[PDB]
Amino acid sequence: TCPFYKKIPGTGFTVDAFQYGVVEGCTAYFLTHFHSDHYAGLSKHFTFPVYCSEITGNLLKNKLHVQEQYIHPLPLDTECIVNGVKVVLLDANHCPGAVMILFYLPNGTVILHTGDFRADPSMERSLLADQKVHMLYLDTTYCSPEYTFPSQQEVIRFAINTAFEAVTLNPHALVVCGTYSIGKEKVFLAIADVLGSKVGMSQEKYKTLQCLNIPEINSLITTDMCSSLVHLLPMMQINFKGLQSHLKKCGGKYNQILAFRPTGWTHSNKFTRIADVIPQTKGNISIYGIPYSEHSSYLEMKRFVQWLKPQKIIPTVNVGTWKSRSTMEKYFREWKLEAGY
Ligand code: NI
């Protein structure tokens, strides 16, 4: 059945609740972003109103074939009325088209649902600064102090310099980058830009990227693999077996692969600095795991919440075990006592 943390009190609304069949009493289904654990259940046969960003609405239409009449895209940073309730969509700093949603309940309560987010100080100067929030439905993916990671900028710097050095040393090296969903486009696009190459990919993946309103995208990507020295492949193929195989397909155009796996967190982060990251190498193939996150670190999440000072927090991630739930609630209380709200 639909869990309580996907329901917005005092409304007929749900968030990211498409796999439960018809939710009893739901008048509008919100979708925060186009990732499969969140859209699971949508298709051309869906006949209820879906509210989302413009980019998420491009993907619903083009990838899932949802009929246009049921897609209700909303502009960001704009007060809108949905079934008599005022809402605003904010940028979530997650993947393309990902939003947070602010609901202004008729009784005066204000609720923020973060969807999936990477908290940032820039959020402290959006429409959130302008009124008090009573309840926060919080992306708690990495809500434990062991989860530290570098800025996105530092990670992209590392990847750009690594790729540039390798290819200038060996002009016959191929760069490969793994992907399994939208998000993290900066990794492969920044590498292609420093090398003066387009990124080559499957027709399915080119179609997905063409829905994202990225500027000058026709200049950066292509389906002609032959003309490209940055290839994108499914994340599952980013291993020695899958990479040797791909190298065989390139017809002796290349004699070395340098591959990037943009993971979330990995426990090399407790010890290792970004400066100190090394590949796993087998023969003429090297694989780098880089900690490019599109979710809040523990410290980034803590700062956002101590700034917002919500009256009640409802976690949306890691809610399936009592030890996780209990540990999260302990951090919430610490933050509150330290900050004084
Ligand atoms: Ni996500």
From Swiss-Prot:
One of its GO terms (molecular function) is zinc ion binding. Expressed in brain, heart, kidney, liver, pancreas, placenta and skeletal muscle. One of its GO terms (biological process) is cell division. GO terms for cellular component: fibrillar center; nucleoplasm. It comes from the Eukaryota. Changing H295A: Impaired nuclear focus formation, reduced interaction with PIAS and increased sensitivity to cisplatin. Induction: During mitosis. The mRNA encoding this protein contains an internal ribosome entry site (IRES) in its 5'-UTR. This 5'-UTR generally suppresses translation while specifically promoting expression during mitosis, when cap-dependent translation may be impaired. It is found in: Nucleus. Its main location: nucleus. Keywords: Cell cycle, Cell division, DNA damage, DNA repair, Hydrolase, Isopeptide bond, Metal-binding, Mitosis, Nucleus, Phosphoprotein, Ubl conjugation, Zinc, Zinc-finger. Binds constitutively to TP53BP1. Binds CDC27, which is itself a component of the anaphase promoting complex (APC). Binds PIAS1. May be required for DNA interstrand cross-link repair. Also required for checkpoint mediated cell cycle arrest in early prophase in response to mitotic spindle poisons. Possesses beta-lactamase activity, catalyzing the hydrolysis of penicillin G and nitrocefin. Exhibits no activity towards other beta-lactam antibiotic classes including cephalosporins (cefotaxime) and carbapenems (imipenem). Belongs to the DNA repair metallo-beta-lactamase (DRMBL) family. This is DNA cross-link repair 1A protein. The chain holds residues 700 to 1040 of 1040 of the full protein.
